[PDB]
Structure formats: structure tokens, C-alpha cells
Ligand binder design. Structure first.
Ligand SMILES: [Ca+2]
Ligand SMILES: [Ca+2]
Ligand SMILES: [Ca+2]
Ligand SMILES: [Ca+2]
Ligand SMILES: [Ca+2]
Ligand SMILES: [Ca+2]
Ligand SMILES: [Ca+2]
Ligand SMILES: [Ca+2]
Ligand SMILES: [Ca+2]
Ligand SMILES: [Ca+2]
Ligand SMILES: [Ca+2]
Ligand SMILES: [Ca+2]
Lengths: 309, 309
């Protein structure tokens, strides 16, 4: 029984072996014995010269196409020697080369995660798959260096399995609204081939910031005979949350209504105006507690102090 | 100068004092010199008998109406003795009684607070006001027992000032969506009068719970010749948050698409069905990672394991 080897993907006409050598035959000996390949299966991948006895490749030999994930990859055929009517079994092993990179089944993974997601939360990652075999197949995964997420991997029989992205440090949309990461999947060839997956994490807002007034206290001095409806003051509060969570409206806290009833606070603009006459007497000052509310139940406070001159 | 006292709110005709007694005059004496009140200001609150010399009340005497918050409350007038044409100055002090309860300027305070509100957060409360004076006016505030809120009060000169409600234990809308409390404002009378304010705290939802599947693993065994479109399994996840925060949808995690592509998972109902033929050989089992997402970026995981018989 005769066994040869050849790497996949050689150029057509690449040398595989000499039948005459391995039968110990010369030129005249070889021809008189009338050798030829019996056509079957993939035998047409090889060409036998009946004068010299050389066996060469005849066409593209792709181990991935022939054998996929099976090992080893052997092409079998008979050589017929017409003289003695004897069949000679030939085996050629097709050697895997590293001509495939680990592939993901998508290019970009889009994730949405609340900024309040608890550390330890685990998300399973798309698998990398390498068409090569053995050392040339998938050997490892790598997640790009970053402060919030790390990679976890189960070390299985033939390689790594079930990659997961695990949250380590808390997210914060007010610091980073989006995170971009890269997952690579590498084989064990030399050099190593690495496939790539882009990961996009969108951080979903939580109402986790109260508004904040520009000042703890707003002082205003107003004329004794100021007309009704006069703008006295504009207050303002900012809020870093998103949408309704960061949208603030203004109002009086309900404390002493007999004071606050003399005034008007625009819920949207924060403009404070007098609604009723103000006395220089009876009340030198007029302290009032005000409130800034966002759209989802967080609040801030300030004091307004109106002095009549 | 002659000084008498009388409590406010006595019945008409109540005794205040005897002018004859304090002038040391008898019947014939008193009459001959011809006494009478000189009408001015609040003198009509009193009636003088010109024969007996008694001074009594003539109508309702309300100290709040006469003197409000000022102290003391004295009604002054002259008595004319027509004989000597001499003016006699009389003072009657009106004694405060505790006939007013501390009042709030509203019946119910409605507050909205996120369940994520930071403990230590302070809210100023409506003021109580008592029309009486001294010991009979506002002396203290009380907040009904509750584990989430305490009352803070400033002890000022004449009474308690600036009551505040302070958050102590974190809120949790999934435990209590609302809290009802009572603020009382009391005077120092005997017995004490107490005014009452109802407080209604509405707890605003935060997405602070992920969904949770009914099981960590769903196993199903299916016949080799199961028709395409067969309902195989219904998964379910619950979520205690409110509205969108608790509304869950179902999907496959992106792991091995070559497996998951053979199936269909309804995003709303959680019904899993087969979409492509299943192989008894190519895949004995079919493990799949599934996901439940709420409407605001939290998620839970489970596994589905499909075996072909
Ligand atoms: Ca190949
Ligand atoms: Ca290969
Ligand atoms: Ca490879
Ligand atoms: Ca944040
Ligand atoms: Ca906010
Ligand atoms: Ca936020
Ligand atoms: Ca009274
Ligand atoms: Ca009172
Ligand atoms: Ca009174
Ligand atoms: Ca909660
Ligand atoms: Ca939720
Ligand atoms: Ca909640």
C-alpha cells in the first residue's frame, strides 16, 4: 500500500510522488506494465504520467471543500497495472494549511444596557468559527482593553467555548453614553489569523441626577411702587439626565401661602413676578422656598428673598 | 387709674368690675356725681350702670379681632363724673383664651418622589398658624410614625419654625407605591388643640428590576418529522417595574446563528416554533440562549435545549 502527502492549494502540476520509485521500476519496465489511474471519486485531482510514473496535482485541491472538519483528509484511488491485471491502492493525505480566518456570522453586535445594570451581568457573545482544522482552527478570543467590560471563556475540549462579556465597573450615561469594543477570535497558525467583531453598547438613561439651581439663594431688591406683573427675577436649574429626566420645571414649595400668593413663578422659564402690591411696611423682606422638578420625581431647592426698598 | 380684667368671649352682661367699689362710693354718693362712659373706640364693649356702678360686658369681646397677635390686649376709655367735670381713666385687659386651633392653609399636600431619591433629602412643610397668643399659640409639630420619613423643626424665638420632612429609609415603589402621613400642629393649651395636614407621597418608578424567566432552562423534545411552524414551547418572564419598565420582549441572543436560524421566537408572546428542518444527525440537541428585555435596558437570560427524537 502506497501513501503520499501534499498540502492543499498547491499550483496545478505540483509533484506528489513517483510510482516508479516506490515500485522499484525503471523506464522500460514501467511502460510495458501499462499503468493508469482507475477513475473514481476525486481521483481526477491527480494526474499520472504513464511513461515516467510521476504523480502530480491536476486541479485545485481544497481540504476545506473535501473534508470540512474531519481529520485526516485522505484521497484514495487505484492504479491499474494492465499487464498483471493488478490493482494498486494509492492514498494521498491532504495536509491542512492555515488559509482561513475565524469568522463571525455578523459584523457588528448592537447592545442596549441601562446605566443601572449591575456589575456581574453576563452577555453571551457571537461565536467565531474557523474552517481549518487542528492547530489552524479557533484557539482563543480577545476583548479589547477597556474599563467596564471583560471577557469570560469556557476552556473546552478542542478550543474555547461560550465567550461572554461581563460587566465589571458600573456604567454611567452622563459620563459615557456609548461604548465601542472589539472582539477578536484568533486561530493557532503562524502567523495567527484573527477575525473581528465590532461591539456597540448604547447606555440607556436612568433618572439618577436631581436638578441643581445655579444658586442656593436668590436675592432681589424691588422698588416700593413696582407695577403689577413686573419681572423680578429669573431662576435656573440644570439637569444632566436625558429627555424628560433632564427637563425641569419650577414652582413654589407650599410653606406660607400668604407670602407666595403675592407672586407668580413661570413653571417653564423660571421668571418670578409680582402678582399683588408689595408693602414696604408689614413685610420688609419676603422669603420664599422654590423647587425645581425634573420630569421623573427628582427635585432641588432654593430660597428667594425679596426686599422692598 | 383703674385696671380691670376679663377673658374674651364671656356671655353678654358678664361682670367686669365695680366703679363704686374702687371709688369708695355708696348709692346716694355714686348717683349724685353722675357717672358715664365717654363713647370712643371699643368702649361699647362695656356697659356701666350709673346707679350701682357695675361695669359689665355689652357684647362679644373677641381678643383675636381686637388685638390679633399683639400683646397685651387692653381696652381704654374715660368715665365722666359730671359733678366735678373730672375724667376717670379705665383700662380693661382682655385675657386670651385658647379658642383657636393651629390651622394649615391647605388640607392635603401632594408630593411626588422618585424611589431613587437620596436619603437625607429634605422637603419644607406647610406652616401651622394659631390665632391665639402666648402659650395658646403654635408650640409644636408632629409627623406620624413612618420608617421612611422624619420631621425636622427649628426652635425659634416664639415657637417652632420651618418644619421639614426628611427622607430616612430608601423608598421602593415595588414595596410601597404610595405613603400617607399626617402632620399635626399643636398649641400649648390645656387641653392641647392640634390642627391636621394630610400628606400623600407618590413614589415614582425607576427601572430598577430586570425581568426574570420562569425557568433557567426550557427543555423540549420534538419528533423528527415535526411540521414547520409548530408551536414548541412558550417562555415567560416577569418584571415588577411599572409601564414600559416592566413590559418584556423576547429574543435569541446572537451566539450560534446556524442553530438559532432553524427557529422563531415571538417577541411578544414568547412562543418558540421551528422555522427550518431539523436533523437527527447534524444536531442531536439544539442549545439556544434566549433573552427577556424590559422597555428600558434591563434583561434576563435563559437556555432552551431542543432534542430531536
Ligand atoms: Ca483551503
Ligand atoms: Ca485549510
Ligand atoms: Ca485558520
Ligand atoms: Ca448616571
Ligand atoms: Ca434628572
Ligand atoms: Ca442618567
Ligand atoms: Ca376669640
Ligand atoms: Ca390655640
Ligand atoms: Ca383666643
Ligand atoms: Ca424598587
Ligand atoms: Ca424592569
Ligand atoms: Ca421600580
Amino acid at each position: 500500500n502506497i501513501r503520499y502527502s501534499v498540502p492543499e492549494e498547491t499550483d496545478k502540476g505540483s509533484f506528489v510522488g513517483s510510482i516508479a520509485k516506490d515500485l522499484g521500476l525503471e523506464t522500460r519496465e514501467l511502460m510495458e506494465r501499462g499503468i493508469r489511474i482507475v477513475s473514481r471519486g476525486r481521483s481526477q485531482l491527480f494526474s499520472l504520467n504513464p511513461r515516467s510514473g510521476s504523480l502530480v496535482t491536476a486541479g485545485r485541491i481544497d481540504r476545506e471543500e473535501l473534508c470540512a472538519q474531519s481529520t485526516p483528509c485522505v484521497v484514495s484511488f487505484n492504479i491499474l497495472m494492465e499487464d498483471e491485471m493488478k490493482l494498486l491502492p494509492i492514498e494521498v493525505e491532504i495536509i491542512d494549511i492555515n488559509d482561513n480566518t475565524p469568522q463571525f456570522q455578523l459584523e457588528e453586535l448592537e447592545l442596549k444596557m441601562s446605566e443601572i445594570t449591575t456589575p456581574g451581568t453576563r452577555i453571551p457573545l457571537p461565536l467565531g468559527q474557523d474552517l481549518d482544522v487542528g492547530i489552524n482552527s479557533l484557539q482563543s478570543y480577545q476583548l479589547s482593553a477597556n474599563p467596564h467590560f471583560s471577557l469570560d471563556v469556557q476552556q473546552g475540549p478542542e478550543g474555547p467555548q461560550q465567550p461572554e462579556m461581563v460587566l465589571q465597573r458600573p456604567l454611567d450615561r452622563e459620563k459615557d453614553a456609548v461604548h465601542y469594543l472589539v472582539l477578536t477570535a484568533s486561530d493557532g497558525g503562524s502567523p495567527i489569523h484573527s477575525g473581528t467583531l465590532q461591539i456597540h453598547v448604547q447606555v440607556v438613561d436612568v433618572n439618577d441626577n436631581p436638578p441643581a439651581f445655579t444658586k442656593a439663594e436668590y436675592h432681589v431688591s424691588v422698588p416700593e411702587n413696582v407695577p403689577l406683573g413686573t419681572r423680578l427675577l429669573k431662576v435656573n436649574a440644570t439637569d444632566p439626565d436625558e429627555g424628560a429626566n433632564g427637563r425641569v420645571t419650577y414652582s413654589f414649595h407650599k410653606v406660607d401661602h400668604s407670602v407666595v400668593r403675592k407672586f407668580q413663578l413661570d413653571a417653564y422659564t423660571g421668571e418670578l413676578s409680582n402678582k399683588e402690591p408689595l408693602d414696604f411696611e408689614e413685610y420688609k423682606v419676603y422669603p420664599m422656598e422654590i423647587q425645581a422638578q425634573d420630569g421623573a420625581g427628582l427635585m432641588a431647592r432654593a430660597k428667594v428673598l425679596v426686599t422692598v426698598l
